[PDB]
């Protein structure tokens, strides 16, 4: 007589598939507003990237929340909840392939 038992298992490792995308400046800024919330505004992103897909990635992988909004001064932009400037910079570099030199980060 005998019995079956698990010998080992595979981890999370896999090969890379990233590639360089074309230059164009992006601005990631922090907001201060009368509702007391801190928000991250994303501006200048290439129109070939769907803003609704940016929302979907930042809600799925980063666990944030956000919307597309038209500001009186800053124009049509994505708002994300909190100070996510480094996180959104990393998304544009990692998932879109945009080179780091294109991304401006601004405080408040």
From Swiss-Prot:
Name a GO CC annotation attached to this entry.
Answer: eukaryotic 43S preinitiation complex
Any matching Pfam family: SUI1
UniProt keywords, alphabetically: Acetylation, Protein biosynthesis, Translation regulation
Task: Output the Gene Ontology terms for molecular function.
Answer: ribosomal small subunit binding; RNA binding; translation initiation factor activity; translation initiation factor binding
Q: How does it assemble?
A: The factors eIF-1, eIF-2, eIF-3, TIF5/eIF-5 and methionyl-tRNAi form a multifactor complex (MFC) that may bind to the 40S ribosome. Interacts with NIP1.
Q: What does this protein do?
A: Additional factor that functions in concert with eIF-2 and the initiator tRNA in directing the ribosome to the proper start site of translation.
The protein depicted here goes by the name Eukaryotic translation initiation factor eIF-1
Source species of the chain: Saccharomyces cerevisiae (strain ATCC 204508 / S288c)
């Amino acid at each position: 007589m005998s019995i079956e038992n698990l010998k080992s298992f595979d981890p999370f490792a896999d090969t890379g598939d990233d590639e360089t995308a074309t230059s164009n400046y992006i601005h990631i800024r922090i907001q201060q507003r009368n509702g007391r919330k801190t928000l991250t505004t994303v501006q200048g992103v290439p129109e070939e990237y769907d803003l609704k897909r940016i929302l979907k990635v930042l809600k799925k992988d980063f666990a944030c929340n956000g919307n597309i909004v038209k500001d009186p001064e800053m124009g049509e932009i994505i708002q994300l909840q909190g100070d996510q400037r480094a996180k959104v910079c990393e998304f544009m570099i990692s998932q879109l392939g945009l080179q780091k030199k294109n991304i401006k980060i601004h405080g408040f």
